[PDB]
Amino acid sequence: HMALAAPPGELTLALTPDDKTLDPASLDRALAILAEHGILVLTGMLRTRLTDQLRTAMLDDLPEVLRQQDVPTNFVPGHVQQDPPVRESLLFPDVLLNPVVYQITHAVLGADARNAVYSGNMNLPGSHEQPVHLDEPHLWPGISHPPYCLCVDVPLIDFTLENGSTEYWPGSHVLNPDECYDERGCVLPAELERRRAVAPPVRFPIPVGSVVIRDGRLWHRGVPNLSAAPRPLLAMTHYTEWFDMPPIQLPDTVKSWVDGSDRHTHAHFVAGDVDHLHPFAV
Amino acid sequence: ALAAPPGELTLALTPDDKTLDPASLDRALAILAEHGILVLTGMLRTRLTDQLRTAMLDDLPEVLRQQDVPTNFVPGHVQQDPPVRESLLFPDVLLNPVVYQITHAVLGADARNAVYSGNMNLPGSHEQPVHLDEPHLWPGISHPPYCLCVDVPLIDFTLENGSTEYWPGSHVLNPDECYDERGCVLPAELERRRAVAPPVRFPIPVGSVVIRDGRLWHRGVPNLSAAPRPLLAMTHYTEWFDMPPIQLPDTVKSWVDGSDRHTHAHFVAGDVDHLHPFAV
Ligand SMILES: NC[C@H]1O[C@H](O[C@H]2[C@H](O)[C@@H](O[C@H]3O[C@H](CO)[C@@H](O)[C@H](N)[C@H]3O)[C@H](N)C[C@@H]2N)[C@H](N)[C@@H](O)[C@@H]1O
Ligand SMILES: NC[C@H]1O[C@H](O[C@H]2[C@H](O)[C@@H](O[C@H]3O[C@H](CO)[C@@H](O)[C@H](N)[C@H]3O)[C@H](N)C[C@@H]2N)[C@H](N)[C@@H](O)[C@@H]1O
Ligand SMILES: O=C(O)CNC(=O)C(=O)O
Ligand SMILES: O=C(O)CNC(=O)C(=O)O
Ligand code: NI
Ligand code: NI
């Protein structure tokens, strides 16, 4: 793998929290990056006010998550599945219904694209290496087809090579040879080494405030958190309208601004609070 | 306009055939891949088709009594669900072993039925526009099937009584700007295709099952007979295609929810009001 000091130029667009929209040329580069590399890094998108509240909430809930009988874990120890809170005080339009994110997902997946994941990945100190996998599979074996889902990953602290910044395999999202994937979405070791020789994986620091948009079929893995502090990641995934997903449970207190929007969410609105503390753990 | 189902599209069975030998199954799949429509004659016992014909003719008055009669494109093509009472839900219709052998091979072991509906073609009906029942998932992209329509005629279909027009090989065609919001084929693309592979209509005897790609171009045509022409309609989808569940009474949960022939079903306490989301 290649270990970098910053997000690579070829994968990165630098914004401010004031940018509501990409100019046509920025949008073209964003789509060209997603088509060729299957991963896009957008720096400077979210205000620290929002990321601080979400970091605090998830660090505060972690003790109650680790206290459960069976802690929902992804592949190997230390990679915990944890939903951020769905209380109205911590549900922010700029996170759930971000205009730049939906501009990109509308262009790739269509105007009918919808968010169907409001979850997260808590990478604990001493965590193991995940096997290289995809979060969502190709819909037929041995077939080349366009994307049907884009993962939207929101780091809630500075991600470093120390504290478990995700390993990404650029260009891996279009690879679908026969016998390549197991029931858990893990890439066959033989196919990993063939690909590694042509386009090796990358890990890079990602500053808090950034958003990562990637093809849900991109090869990646969680890696060890070698720091003394949990590394919280907030996770969303936009799908084409026709992909079967369970709805996100939201309180009906946010129905007015969520269910209005032309930035769609597959949502079920509940009276009172939702118990957020797992179907998405593999 | 033919006198019988064409040889190239047809496999002749008896109601006793539970499963195709590998060579029969290969021919069935080769037909679905090339032509996108397969006709299986002699599959269902007249016992079953008579009960379903009678039930749907008996329910038609209650359908025509509705304020807005759910109609497909043009007058005379009525959307009508067959009953979901336990006495008229037959494993050999819902969970047919030959149908699911074919749909398991094309769509995978996880494929599920998500439609238990029907198409009642009334005497004096108009011509539907050529359309597909389910679209391609991306514009301008060639991709494999994700759904197979299972059409079960409940009387002998004739050129007179509105046997469906089918466009063989049309299931793989997805050129830019070809399809409207209703699934209708642009007339320009119809004429281009007509020159290469023109459409077919043929009689289909009751007891037959038609399996076709859900993307196959077809249309309802006028029923010029004195009698309504009932069609029972099912559609198998890949596990990952979003569909609403079929409402079934929990009295059939034991044998439906058991099966490795999957149904996207929601089981209800008591009876379901079957008399529309599938009318276009
Ligand atoms: N990047 C966001 C999240 O992505 C992954 O979760 C995914 C699952 O992977 C996916 O499941 C798919 O892959 C499974 C294993 O092959 C199959 O069982 C399943 N049928 C198949 O649809 C679900 N659809 C949705 C869920 N969000 C990670 N695990 C999770 O930690 C992370 O937060
Ligand atoms: N042979 C089975 C049946 O096929 C069609 O019913 C289909 C709909 O067509 C389809 O709708 C699709 O096409 C519409 C028009 O473009 C779109 O709105 C929609 N997004 C799109 O998924 C639904 N998903 C499922 C339904 N069973 C016919 N109408 C009906 O008479 C016939 O019995
Ligand atoms: O959290 C991360 O950095 C990566 N985690 C995963 O890829 C997962 O659990 O599926
Ligand atoms: O009933 C028929 O023969 C054909 N009908 C249709 O294609 C329809 O209404 O979608
Ligand atoms: Ni993952
Ligand atoms: Ni139709």
CB atoms within 10 A of CB B260: 8
Q: Which of B221, B186, B29, B188 is nearest to B106 (CA)?
A: B29
For A231, the enclosing helix (H) or strand (E) is strand A231-239
Among residues B178, B164, B25, which one has the least CA distance to residue B97?
B25
> Residues preceding discontinuities in chain B at C–N > 2.5 Å?
275
Shortest CA distance to B244 belongs to which of B196, B214, B210, B277? B277
Distances (CA, A) of A23 to A12, A45, A94, A238, A263: 15, 15, 19, 22, 19
> Reported resolution in A?
2.5
CA atoms within 13 A on the CB side of A218: 31
A148 contact residues in B (CB cutoff 8 A): 137
What tokens appear for B269 in the block? 């306490």
B179: three-class secondary structure by DSSP: strand
Distance separating alpha carbons of residues A167 and A1, to the nearest angstrom:
8
Compute, in angstroms, the gap from residue B79 CA to the centroid of ligand 3. 47
Note whether A245 contacts B241, CB cutoff 8 Å.
Answer: no
CA angle at B106 for the pair B104 and B107, rounded to the nearest 5°: 65
Contact call for A143 and B141, based on CB within 8 A: no
Phi-psi region of A228 (alpha: psi -120 to 50; beta: other; left: phi over 0): alpha
Contacts for A196 with CB less than 8 Å, ≥ 6 apart: none
Distance in angstroms (rounded) separating the CA atoms of residues A244 and A242: 6
Tell me how far the alpha carbon of residue A171 lies from the centroid of ligand 2, in angstroms.
36
Q: What is d(CA B258, CA A32) in angstroms, rounded to the nearest whole number? A: 47
Burial grade of B182 (CB within 10 A; 0-12, 13-18, 19 or more): exposed
In this structure, which amino acid lies at residue A205?
Answer: P
From the list B102, B232, B263, B212, the residue with the least C-alpha distance to B157 is B232
- Closest partner residue to A139 (CB to CB) among B240, B242, B243 is B240
Mutate which: A143, A144, A145, vs B, most B CBs within 10 A: A145
Residues of chain B with C-beta less than 8 angstroms from the C-beta of A240:
137
**Ligand 1 pocket residue status of A215, Cβ below 6 Å:** no
Report CA(B243)–ligand 2 centroid distance (Å). 10
Is B38 within 8 Å of B5 (Cβ atoms)? Answer: no
Ligand nearest to the CA of A282: 1
What are the angstrom distances between the C-alpha of B1 and each of B11, B31, B200, B203? 20, 20, 6, 9
Q: Which residue of A has its CA nearest to B106?
A: A140
CA of A108 to the centre of ligand 1 (A): 20
Question: Could you give the dihedral angle defined by the CA atoms of residues B121, B45, B263 and B97, in that order, rounded to the nearest 10 degrees?
Answer: -130
**Ligand 4 atom index nearest CA of B119:** 1
| Cα separation, B32 vs B105, whole angstroms | 11
How many CB atoms are located within 10 Å of the residue B43 CB? 22
Amino acid at B31: I
Within chain A, residue ranges assigned H as helices are 24-36, 48-67, 93-96, 99-109, 189-198, 255-258
Instruction: Report d(CA B82, CA B77) in Å as an integer.
Output: 15
CA distances from A270 to A93, A240, A252, A255 (A): 18, 24, 5, 9
Q: Taking the CA atoms of A98, A99, A103 and A104 in sequence, report the sign of the dihedral they define.
A: negative
* Interatomic CA distance for residues B233 and B209, integer angstroms: 10
Instruction: Report the candidate in A149, A118, A127, A125 with the shortest Cα–Cα distance to residue A222.
Output: A127
Residue from the list B141, B144, B240 with its beta carbon closest to the beta carbon of A243: B240
CA separation for the pair B165, B70 (Å, rounded)? 21
User: To the nearest 10°, the Cα dihedral for B68, B73, B78, B81?
Assistant: -90
Strands (E) in B122-225, as ranges, are 147-153, 165-166, 209-213, 218-219
Q: What is the DSSP string of A6-64?
A: S--GGGEEE--TT--S--HHHHHHHHHHHHHTSEEEEES-S-HHHHHHHHHHHHHHHHH
Q: Which class in CATH covers the domain with range B7-268?
A: mainly beta
Contacts with B98 (C-beta within 8 Å, 6 or more apart), sequence order = B13, B17, B18, B19, B20, B40, B43, B209
Nearest CA to ligand 1 atom 25: A280
Angle at B79 between CA B12 and CA B267, to 5 degrees: 85
> Which residues partner with A91 through β-bridges?
none
Q: Where are the domains of chain A?
A: 2-270
CATH classification code of A2-270:
2.60.120.620
Check: CB of residue B221 under 8 Å from CB of residue B56. Answer: no
A281: closest CA among A101, A65, A126? A65
Dmax (CA) of chain A: 54
CA distance B37 to B41: 13
Optimal mutation site among B112, B138, B141, B262, interface A, most CBs of chain A within 10 A: B138
* Beta carbons within 8 Å of B26's beta carbon, 6+ residues apart: none
CA–CA separation, B114 and A126 (whole Å)? 46
CA distances from A264 to A76, A117, A255, A269 (A): 33, 12, 12, 14
Experimental technique used?
A: X-ray
Q: Which helix (H) or strand (E) holds B248?
A: strand B246-249
Extract the runs of DSSP E, i.e. beta strands, from A113-193.
114-123, 149-155, 167-168
Distances in Å between the Cα of B112 and the Cα atoms of A7, A259, B103, B177, B238 are 44, 30, 9, 30, 7
